[PDB]
Amino acid sequence: RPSLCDLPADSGSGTKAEKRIYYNSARKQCLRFDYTGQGGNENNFRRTYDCQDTCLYT
């Protein structure tokens, strides 16, 4: 798996309230989180499809 898949969920440094998906390595699932729109990390996907393609099905 890419190393970004092991990064923690990170809501970022902004004040927006946006739906994103993160890979939860311990659960082997792409899960929902709230993102503030800036200052996150790479474990941050708009679609479940992209998180699964990148992190689950490697």
Which residue, 42, 37, 39, is CA-closest to 55? Answer: 42
End-to-end Cα, the chain, rounded Å: 6
Tokens for 54, please give them. Answer: 């990148």
Residues composing the chain: 58
Which residue, 2, 41, 47, 46, is CA-closest to 25? Answer: 2
Q: How was it solved?
A: X-ray
Residue by residue, what is the 3-state secondary structure of the chain?
Answer: CCHHHHCCCCCCCCCCCEEEEEEECCCCEEEEEEECCCCCCCCCECCHHHHHHHHHCC
Which CATH superfamily is 1-58 part of? Pancreatic trypsin inhibitor Kunitz domain (4.10.410.10)
Tokens for 27, please give them. Answer: 């659960």
Residue 27 CA to residue 37 CA, distance in Å, equals 25
The domain locations on the chain are: 1-58
- Alpha-carbon separation of residue 5 from 14, 16, 50, 57 (angstroms): 22, 23, 12, 11
Residue 45 CA to residue 33 CA, distance in Å, equals 10
